[PDB]
């Protein structure tokens, strides 16, 4: 996830290093899913 | 949307009642796809 893009992850998410995923990905807010959190999971609340 | 509680259409979308079918529809905002506007179309 582009650490310079600034607004790469959508819906108030934040690009960072997720250890559990041992990668630099989008850390979305509870509910959203997808590479940049573009999708919403209505089954997850 | 006569519904008392807000949130049927996520992401600033407006809801509407389709009498003929007793079904609810949503008027998502541009860039949003889905029955209730869940998906952002990039």
Curated annotation (Swiss-Prot), chain A:
Intrachain disulfide bonds: 1-15, 9-26, 28-37
Domain EGF-like: 1-38
Superkingdom, natural source: Eukaryota
Full protein name: Epidermal growth factor
Gene that produces this protein: EGF
